[PDB]
């Protein structure tokens, strides 16, 4: 079961990371008890042992759903402690140490993750997610003034956000979609497209700045999707083709 394989390769890289100096605070989770406000700041907790176990109930197909995990585990410390601190140093030599291993890896691991999700080596697949890549960066980030959409809100800084907005997205988080070939259609990027906006009529007001400018962001989607149309319409029906094709086998 390539699957089976891939978990032993995930696990010996947590097993190389927790061997690295001074990374016991990231073995395990962060107790909340102790520290209190760590919920208040923090919104996707992420340790090496919930990593493992992870890996154990076969959640990671692929080397990019384990490093956004394990990513996590930066981005909180860099949150929490600092970006300069020591600790978040500490979980930076991991996640460099995790490229490395990934780096040394790669054809294996790309044999294995097209095993488990052959769209991932469909031609079609591929150039339908380089189109919305390219709609993503050329189009929507380039709508001005649209920096409060390009990534997650940070709740650090927004301590509310995520009491109002249970649904969030945001344009980095469909890049991340787009790499991991989540969409096989219009439909379902245009429902995270829409999340955008949806969020911020809910959080900011149907006639806030903010909403105009997330409008604008989901009509010049729908702007250059109209334009492509002929070319995504044959995509999509080779990529269903394709999905048949590897349940069949
Ligand atoms: C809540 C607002 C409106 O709704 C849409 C999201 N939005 C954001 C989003 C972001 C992010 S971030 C940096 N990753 O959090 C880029 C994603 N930042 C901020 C923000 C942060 C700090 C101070 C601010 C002071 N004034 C205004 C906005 C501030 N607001």
Same mark, same amino acid.
């Given at each position: 079961?390539?699957?089976?394989?891939?978990?032993?390769?995930?696990?010996?890289?947590?097993?190389?990371?927790?061997?690295?100096?001074?990374?016991?605070?990231?073995?395990? *989770? @962060? +107790?909340? /008890?102790? %520290?209190?406000? &760590? !919920?208040?700041?923090?919104?996707? =907790? $992420?340790? #090496?042992?919930?990593?493992?176990?992870?890996?154990?109930?076969?959640?990671?197909?692929?080397?990019?759903?384990?490093?956004?995990?394990?990513?996590?585990?930066?981005?909180?410390?860099?949150?929490?402690?600092?970006?300069?601190?020591?600790?978040?140093?500490?979980?930076?030599?991991?996640?460099?140490?995790?490229?490395?291993?990934?780096?040394?890896?790669?054809?294996?691991?790309?044999?294995?993750?097209?095993?488990?999700?052959?769209?991932?080596?469909?031609?079609?697949?591929?150039?339908?997610?380089?189109?919305?890549?390219?709609?993503?960066?050329?189009?929507?980030?380039?709508?001005?003034?649209?920096?409060?959409?390009?990534? *997650? @809100? +940070?709740? /650090?800084? %927004?301590?509310? &956000? !995520?009491?109002?907005?249970?649904? =969030? $997205?945001? #344009?980095?988080?469909?890049?991340?979609?787009?790499?991991?070939?989540?969409?096989?259609?219009?439909?379902?990027?245009?429902?995270?497209?829409?999340?955008?906006?949806?969020?911020?009529?809910?959080?900011?007001?149907?006639?806030?700045?903010?909403?105009?400018?997330?409008?604008?962001?989901?009509?010049?989607?729908?702007?250059?999707?109209?334009?492509?149309?002929?070319?995504?319409?044959?995509?999509?029906?080779?990529?269903?083709?394709?999905?048949?094709?590897?349940?069949?086998?």
């Amino acid at each position: 079961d390539p699957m089976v394989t891939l978990s032993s390769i995930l696990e010996s890289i947590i097993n190389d990371m927790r061997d690295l100096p001074n990374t016991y605070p990231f073995h395990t *989770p @962060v +107790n909340a /008890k102790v %520290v209190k406000d &760590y !919920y208040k700041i923090i919104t996707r =907790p $992420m340790d #090496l042992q919930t990593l493992r176990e992870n890996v154990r109930k076969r959640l990671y197909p692929s080397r990019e759903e384990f490093r956004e995990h394990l990513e996590l585990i930066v981005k909180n410390s860099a949150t929490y402690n600092g970006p300069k601190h020591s600790l978040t140093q500490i979980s930076q030599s991991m996640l460099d140490l995790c490229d490395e291993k990934l780096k040394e890896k790669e054809d294996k691991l790309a044999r294995l993750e097209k095993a488990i999700n052959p769209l991932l080596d469909d031609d079609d697949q591929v150039a339908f997610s380089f189109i919305l890549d390219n709609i993503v960066t050329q189009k929507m980030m380039a709508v001005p003034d649209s920096w409060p959409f390009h990534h *997650p @809100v +940070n709740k /650090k800084f %927004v301590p509310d &956000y !995520y009491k109002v907005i249970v649904n =969030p $997205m945001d #344009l980095e988080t469909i890049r991340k979609n787009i790499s991991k070939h989540k969409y096989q259609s219009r439909e379902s990027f245009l429902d995270d497209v829409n999340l955008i906006l949806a969020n911020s009529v809910k959080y900011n007001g149907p006639e806030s700045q903010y909403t105009k400018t997330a409008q604008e962001i989901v009509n010049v989607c729908y702007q250059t999707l109209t334009e492509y149309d002929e070319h995504l319409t044959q995509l999509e029906k080779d990529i269903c083709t394709a999905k048949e094709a590897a349940l069949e086998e």
